[PDB]
Design an enzyme around this catalytic site. Structure first.
Site, PDB file in Angstrom:
ATOM      1  N   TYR A  49      45.112  39.334  38.419  1.00 35.34           N
ATOM      2  CA  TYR A  49      44.490  38.139  38.973  1.00 35.34           C
ATOM      3  C   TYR A  49      45.404  36.929  38.915  1.00 35.34           C
ATOM      4  O   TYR A  49      44.972  35.812  39.223  1.00 35.34           O
ATOM      5  CB  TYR A  49      43.199  37.824  38.230  1.00 35.34           C
ATOM      6  CG  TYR A  49      42.198  38.922  38.345  1.00 35.34           C
ATOM      7  CD1 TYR A  49      41.509  39.120  39.525  1.00 35.34           C
ATOM      8  CD2 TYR A  49      41.940  39.762  37.277  1.00 35.34           C
ATOM      9  CE1 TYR A  49      40.594  40.134  39.646  1.00 35.34           C
ATOM     10  CE2 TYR A  49      41.022  40.778  37.383  1.00 35.34           C
ATOM     11  CZ  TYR A  49      40.351  40.958  38.574  1.00 35.34           C
ATOM     12  OH  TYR A  49      39.430  41.968  38.698  1.00 35.34           O
ATOM     13  N   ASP A  50      46.647  37.120  38.510  1.00 33.67           N
ATOM     14  CA  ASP A  50      47.570  36.025  38.279  1.00 33.67           C
ATOM     15  C   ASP A  50      48.175  35.513  39.582  1.00 33.67           C
ATOM     16  O   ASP A  50      47.737  35.850  40.684  1.00 33.67           O
ATOM     17  CB  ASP A  50      48.656  36.484  37.309  1.00 33.67           C
ATOM     18  CG  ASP A  50      49.294  37.799  37.729  1.00 33.67           C
ATOM     19  OD1 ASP A  50      48.880  38.373  38.756  1.00 33.67           O
ATOM     20  OD2 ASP A  50      50.193  38.287  37.020  1.00 33.67           O
ATOM     21  N   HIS A 109      41.854  43.592  43.517  1.00 35.31           N
ATOM     22  CA  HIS A 109      40.630  43.127  42.886  1.00 35.31           C
ATOM     23  C   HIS A 109      40.433  41.639  43.095  1.00 35.31           C
ATOM     24  O   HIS A 109      39.547  41.038  42.484  1.00 35.31           O
ATOM     25  CB  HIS A 109      40.625  43.475  41.406  1.00 35.31           C
ATOM     26  CG  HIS A 109      40.514  44.939  41.153  1.00 35.31           C
ATOM     27  ND1 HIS A 109      39.343  45.634  41.342  1.00 35.31           N
ATOM     28  CD2 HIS A 109      41.429  45.846  40.747  1.00 35.31           C
ATOM     29  CE1 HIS A 109      39.537  46.907  41.055  1.00 35.31           C
ATOM     30  NE2 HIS A 109      40.795  47.062  40.689  1.00 35.31           N
TER      31      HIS A 109
END
EC number: 3.2.2.5
Lengths: 633, 628, 102
Positions: free
Chosen positions: A123-124, A160
């Site tokens: 998610y970075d 995601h």
């Protein structure tokens, strides 16, 4: 630099085979890394359990005592989301993920293998901004409308979501219900990921063998066929070494595990030396430093030159790009080193040339490969290192009937029946030279129709180029000869021929083995040598006015031997690009400044022996008015 | 490919199988009644397109031609060399991202490469979504180019201390494998369509077509392509500096203007010397700038050698004076203080040396000449100009100019400074040329021979014995003194030297020639006779010029055949006259040997012998320009 | 054996080539430069002018039998070669290590 070599000496067969597969998949450019949480958490990135901790802090108050299993990482946020709602949940999401953590070197080592796609579950913004710092546009594809507006063919598939579009729980996949009906919220991202996995070499790095994404994909690949897919790899960096039943089970499940803890000696917390251990084992596997056997260097050289056994002549400034910037091939047959951070394979090859005892030491197939490479290097005019120099007797011998002007023997070769497709290619070029442009056009077409599958590709690629060049000579020729039916036929045939994507559409083998044959599909390609001619005209035109009778070496001869390299490359590989005006300007300007240059060095008084080939070049690539003006000045 | 846009503002049609939309657009330009017929939004669009076409220098069709007055006006502070206003723009706060982009390019030009690199990064971080794309695309290119200038710059600065090693590590881990060849291929759908003219900037060699046209000049050449080529320089160059591109600093562009201006200067020379039947190149301010910046000094030398800049004239000489006084004040303010950006010093000192060297030919005022001469003598740094090289440059600045007494005061101040610096007995006086400060004195004696130095007179009123270097140096500065102090320095009278009366006493002094030095020459030549049975040309020339007065020389025939060639011209055997002997003589001698007939006609035959037999052009030029 | 650098500047009849002389005129480490100013103002009547170096000027009384001459690169005492270039040329200073050409 020595321990990694020793680890390469202590590897078994299987791991070595896996490294060879990876460096093959990188060198074709089919390598796709499937990274995960682990490669991000060495950037001191916030892991997910800490979020679950603070969620439990606002959920049940006092800290939870002991273990967090799998579903608490999904349920405790889910409970939080049903109690405190969206906004506060986004609040903790912002306060934890508004970070500016720097980039690990293992992101660099991942981005040093030239990946086609990069798939990920983070998610970075670490690996994409690492790519913005680099120059490799990976189209960051995080949501479904990112797919239809994907602007490149090299992806960065965050499967995601991302906090790129705000720190909200709408855009990322965090809670239990989100992972539940994933394939009706994001139906297209999974299609693209499964497409990339089915068409590439997937290498897992940053996971453990209990991860839900890994077991999800392994469920999908068990739903597939047997022989359809390619078995993925799995870099395992765990504190404990892998067990044998996990080995047998997960290898039979479909993965190919490369362990990092059972390859080096490390500690319980030193992840980065294991990530860099196996990952740099891949990188210095690309850097040829592990090549030390004499048989292996023959394999390497034959692996890079056995493509070029079909071509009649190879330029020196193309052979520089065969072994890509590992040497500088200068035009006298003398080779120097430049950026060969490796074994020195050509040096060992010349040691294999003079030494008779070493040639017996090899195997028989590589002995015959050595003889073929030997005939290659003697033919193309590269004789030795610059260490052992000597009698650098340089002489061009063009063995082409079109250059010398032997028009009789050309005709006599044309009406003879050919029994090979490469004899047809020459025969085509010959009657291209005789002005028989129609039959040469058709013979260029028949070779394409009848050598398409795999000869070498070269007599399918060059003949298509030569057909387009003889089309340009006919079309430009009738501008200012031929029946109008043939003009209509080649107009409806060559109507919008783009040459600028021909090599880009040649197959996977052709683009790798012949990425020196792409300037021929380019319009202006003879222009670097022009800029060197200005170095002549500049300040080695500054020595006539001082009377400096010097007697040393100059770039003059070098330039002349570069004429004799380009010119010999065109006529001997039977290229119709000789007839155009770029080449005519090239020999015009080049011979003009060498004649005026040798005049200039002659009149510094305050050689230029002119052999047969120069008489030919003046007689053909000039006009009479040019030769007048070479008599004048 | 719907038209061919040629460089004069004239547009022709090529393959416009259509309405002729640009023709209708120019019809909309002149016709006032047609502009009313449109709608209001397309009227304002017409005004914006109107401002576009007037700005970019495309005025009309080739049907209606006329006064094609073409003039480049570069409106960029980096081109003109205005380094002050650049700094004053940088420390001002910007309120737009496009002002940041210019501000970045400016401190890229000033050698502040680190802060410009970071400002190139911040624009990328803060203009990513959609401004136009151009200040996200070009700034990424300019960041990569300034990365290439830093990386290539620290390659040979080490092998004095340009940048910290932490910044080198940071840009190495940032720009590690930057491929520029896919940047535009990864720009979005709108950018690739609207700006498929901005993709050569992400390409390495892109200035090469114009090079091939320069060969058409050099080959077999009313109106010509010459002006066209020049207006193509002024199109590429104007494109780089005005859109603030850092690709100007590399070597491809430097070779481009080098080769292009070289062949236009040699080309206009060539068209000037087409004179074998029938007995321009005006060189404006921008050409003075381009020669001063994109050449080296050795290039400008070689443009003086082969082609001849005597015919070449110079206009706009007031702005040339402004550029020169700007270089003078900038080298002044950079070296009146400790200010040294080492990078900016290197590029600036190339421009400065080349500008003053090429500023021989232009004309100046008195106060401008005072400012440039003052900056050239005093504040100009060492290691680049030595005190004979400064005489070359200053000699150039004073040769074609009548010296208006203030430069005599300034050079006098420099002589006082040299006399006050030769006090220490360790001074070296580099100028490995051979020219020294005595030549500065000789220059003053060449323009104002009646000049008396005040402070040097006071210094020679205070030299007893103790400072030997200062004595010797001031002796080489002899004729600018006052008579009592002159004799006070002539407390140390000469020795029994002969050519060390020239080499030791390098101030003439044959005007003061003692009779015992005729006698000392007699003693010298009789010792050379008694040692002959067991330098020189200087007094043989001195007897031939009749500056000395002695008839002893006639009994010394045979010791030197040069001396035999200058004592008795009539009885000299010209059969054994060595030719070499003719390249070492200057115009006064080669120009009074022609005055001596018995010499002159014999050397006419042997110079015709050597010019006809060999292919020398020294003997050819002496055969043409002095003798006959 | 360093003929690959031997230039024969012949407006002033020199042999510009970096040697390092050891002289008796007794010093060490000598090297010579020469001028070409024929338009020199008050600086004799000669075009050229020697500017003898001894790590700086020696500040000149000069006869100079040559004692030791060594090439810079290969160190190759080129003594006899220098004598050969003195056996032909009748000018002062045959080997002159730089020429300015004003």
């Amino acid at each position: 630099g020595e321990k990694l070599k020793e680890v390469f000496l202590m590897l078994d067969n299987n791991v070595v085979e896996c490294i060879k597969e990876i460096t093959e998949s990188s060198r074709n450019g089919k390598l796709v890394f499937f990274v995960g949480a682990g490669v991000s958490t060495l950037s001191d990135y916030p892991q997910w359990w800490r979020l679950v901790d603070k969620y439990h802090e606002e959920l049940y108050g006092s800290p939870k005592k002991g273990n967090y299993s799998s579903d608490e990482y999904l349920r405790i946020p889910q409970i939080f989301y049903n109690v405190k709602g969206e906004m506060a949940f986004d609040g903790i999401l912002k306060d934890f993920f508004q970070v500016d953590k720097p980039t690990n070197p293992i992101h660099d080592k991942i981005l040093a293998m030239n990946p086609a796609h990069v798939i990920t579950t983070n998610y970075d913004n670490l690996i994409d901004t690492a790519c913005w710092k680099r120059g490799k546009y990976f189209s960051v594809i995080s949501a479904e409308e990112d797919v239809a507006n994907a602007t490149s063919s090299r992806y960065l598939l965050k499967v995601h979501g991302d906090f790129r579009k705000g720190f909200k729980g709408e855009n990322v996949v965090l809670k239990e219900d989100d992972y539940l009906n994933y394939d009706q919220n994001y139906p297209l991202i999974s299609n693209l990921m499964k497409t990339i996995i089915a068409t590439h070499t997937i290498v897992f790095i940053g996971y453990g063998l209990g991860d839900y994404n890994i077991n999800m994909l392994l469920n999908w690949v068990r739903k597939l066929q047997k022989d359809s897919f390619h078995k993925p790899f799995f870099i395992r960096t765990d504190p404990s070494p892998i067990e044998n039943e996990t080995l047998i089970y997960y290898e039979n499940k479909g993965l190919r595990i490369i362990d990092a803890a059972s390859l080096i000696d490390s500690n319980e917390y030193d992840y980065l030396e294991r990530y860099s251990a196996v990952m740099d084992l891949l990188i210095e596997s690309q850097e040829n430093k592990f090549i030390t056997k004499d048989d292996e260097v023959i394999d390497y050289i034959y692996g890079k030159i056995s493509p070029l056994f079909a071509l009649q002549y190879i330029r020196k400034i193309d052979l520089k790009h065969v072994f890509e910037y590992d040497y500088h091939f200068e035009v006298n047959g003398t080779v120097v080193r430049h950026k060969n951070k490796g074994f020195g394979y050509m040096e060992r090859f010349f040691e294999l040339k003079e030494s008779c005892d070493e040639r017996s030491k090899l195997s028989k197939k590589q002995y015959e490969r050595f003889n073929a490479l030997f005939n290659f290097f003697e033919k193309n005019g590269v004789i030795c290192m610059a260490k052992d120099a000597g009698t650098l007797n340089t002489s061009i011998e063009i063995n082409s009937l079109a250059y010398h002007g032997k028009y009789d023997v050309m005709k006599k070769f044309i009406e003879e029946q050919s029994v090979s497709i490469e004899d047809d290619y020459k025969k085509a070029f010959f009657l291209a030279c005789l002005g028989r442009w129609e039959e040469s056009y058709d013979l260029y077409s028949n070779i394409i129709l009848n050598s398409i599958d795999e000869s070498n590709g070269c007599v399918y690629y060059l003949s298509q180029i030569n057909r387009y060049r003889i089309y340009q000579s006919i079309t430009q020729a009738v501008t200012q000869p031929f029946t109008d039916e043939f003009l209509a036929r080649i107009e409806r045939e060559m109507t919008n021929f783009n040459i600028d994507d021909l090599f880009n559409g040649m197959p996977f083998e052709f683009q790798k083995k012949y990425k020196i044959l792409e300037f021929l599909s380019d319009n202006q390609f003879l222009y670097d040598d022009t800029v060197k001619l200005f170095e002549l005209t500049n300040k080695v035109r500054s020595e006539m006015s001082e009377g400096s009778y010097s007697f040393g070496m100059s770039s003059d001869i070098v330039v002349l031997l570069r004429l004799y390299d380009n010119l010999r490359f065109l006529y001997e590989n039977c290229l119709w690009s000789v007839s155009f005006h770029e080449f005519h300007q090239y020999i015009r300007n080049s011979m003009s400044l060498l004649i005026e240059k040798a005049e200039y060095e002659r009149t510094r008084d305050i050689g230029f022996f002119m052999e047969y080939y120069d008489f030919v070049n003046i007689s053909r690539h000039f006009k009479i008015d040019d030769i007048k003006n070479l008599e004048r000045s | 490919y719907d038209y061919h846009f040629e460089v004069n503002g004239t547009v022709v049609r090529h393959k416009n199988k259509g309405f002729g939309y640009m023709e209708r657009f120019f019809e909309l330009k002149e016709s006032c009644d047609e502009r009313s017929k449109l709608s209001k939004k397309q009227y304002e669009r017409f005004n914006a397109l109107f401002n576009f076409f007037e700005k970019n220098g495309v005025i009309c069709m080739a049907k209606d031609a006329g006064t094609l007055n073409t003039s480049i006006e570069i409106n960029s502070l980096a081109y003109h060399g205005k380094y002050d206003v650049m700094k004053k723009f940088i420390e001002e706060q910007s309120v737009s991202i496009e002002d940041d982009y210019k501000k970045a390019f400016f401190l890229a030009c000033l050698g502040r490469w680190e802060e410009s690199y970071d400002l190139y990064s911040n624009i990328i971080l803060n203009s990513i979504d959609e401004s136009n794309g151009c200040v996200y695309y070009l700034s990424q290119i300019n960041r990569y180019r300034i990365y290439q200038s830093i990386t290539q710059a620290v390659t040979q600065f080490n092998g004095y201390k340009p940048f910290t090693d932490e910044f080198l590590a940071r840009i190495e881990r940032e720009m590690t494998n930057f491929n520029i060849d896919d940047l535009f291929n990864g720009m979005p759908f709108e950018f690739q369509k609207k700006y498929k003219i901005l993709e050569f900037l992400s390409d390495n060699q892109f200035l090469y077509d114009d090079t091939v046209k320069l060969f058409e000049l050099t080959n077999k050449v009313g109106m010509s392509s010459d002006i066209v080529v020049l207006l193509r320089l002024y199109d590429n160059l104007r494109f780089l500096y005005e859109n603030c591109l850092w690709s100007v600093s590399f070597h491809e562009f430097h070779q481009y203007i080098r080769n292009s201006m070289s062949l236009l200067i040699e080309k206009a020379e060539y068209e000037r010397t087409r004179d074998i039947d029938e007995l321009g190149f005006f060189m404006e301010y921008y050409d003075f700038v381009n020669i001063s910046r994109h050449f080296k000094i050795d290039d400008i030398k070689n443009l003086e050698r082969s082609c001849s800049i005597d015919k070449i004239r110079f206009g706009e000489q007031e702005k040339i004076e402004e550029y020169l006084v700007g270089i003078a004040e900038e080298i002044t303010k950079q070296f009146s203080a400790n200010g040294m950006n080492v990078v900016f010093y290197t590029q600036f000192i190339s421009e400065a040396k080349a500008a003053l060297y090429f500023a021989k030919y232009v004309k100046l005022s008195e106060e401008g000449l005072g400012k440039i001469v003052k900056a050239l003598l005093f504040y100009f740094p060492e290691r680049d100009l030595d005190i004979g090289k400064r005489y070359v440059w200053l000699e150039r600045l004073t040769k074609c100019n009548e010296l208006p007494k203030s430069i005599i005061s300034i050079i006098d101040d420099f002589l006082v400074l040299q006399a006050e610096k030769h006090i220490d007995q360790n001074y070296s006086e580099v100028s490995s040329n051979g020219l020294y400060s005595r030549d500065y004195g000789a220059l003053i004696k060449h323009f104002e021979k009646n000049f008396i130095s005040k402070r040097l007179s006071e210094i020679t009123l205070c030299l007893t014995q103790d400072k030997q270097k200062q004595i010797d140096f001031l002796f080489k500065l002899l004729p600018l003194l006052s008579t009592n102090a002159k004799s006070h320095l002539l407390s140390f009278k000469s020795v029994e030297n002969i050519n060390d009366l020239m080499n030791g006493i390098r101030i003439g002094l044959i005007d003061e020639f003692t009779p015992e030095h005729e006698e000392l020459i007699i003693e010298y030549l009789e010792t050379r006779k008694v040692n002959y049975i067991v330098y020189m040309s200087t007094f043989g020339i001195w007897y031939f010029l009749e500056e000395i007065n002695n008839s002893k020389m006639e009994e010394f025939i045979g010791m030197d055949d040069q001396y035999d060639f200058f004592v008795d011209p009539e009885n000299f055997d010209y059969k054994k006259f060595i030719p070499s002997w003719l390249k070492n003589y200057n115009d006064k001698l080669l120009g009074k040997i022609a005055g001596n007939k018995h010499m002159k006609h014999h050397v006419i035959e042997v110079l015709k012998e050597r010019v006809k037999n060999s292919n020398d052009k020294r003997y050819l030029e002496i055969l043409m320009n002095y003798f006959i | 054996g360093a003929t690959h650098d031997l230039v024969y500047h012949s407006k002033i009849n020199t042999f510009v080539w970096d040697v390092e002389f050891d002289i008796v005129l007794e010093l060490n480490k000598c090297y010579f430069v020469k001028c070409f100013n024929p338009y020199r103002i008050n600086g004799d009547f000669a075009v050229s002018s020697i500017d003898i170096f001894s790590e700086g000027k020696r500040l000149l009384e000069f006869n100079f039998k040559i004692t030791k001459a060594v090439h810079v690169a290969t160190s190759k005492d080129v003594t006899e070669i220098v004598l050969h270039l003195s056996e032909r040329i009748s000018s002062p200073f045959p080997i002159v290590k730089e020429v300015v050409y004003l």
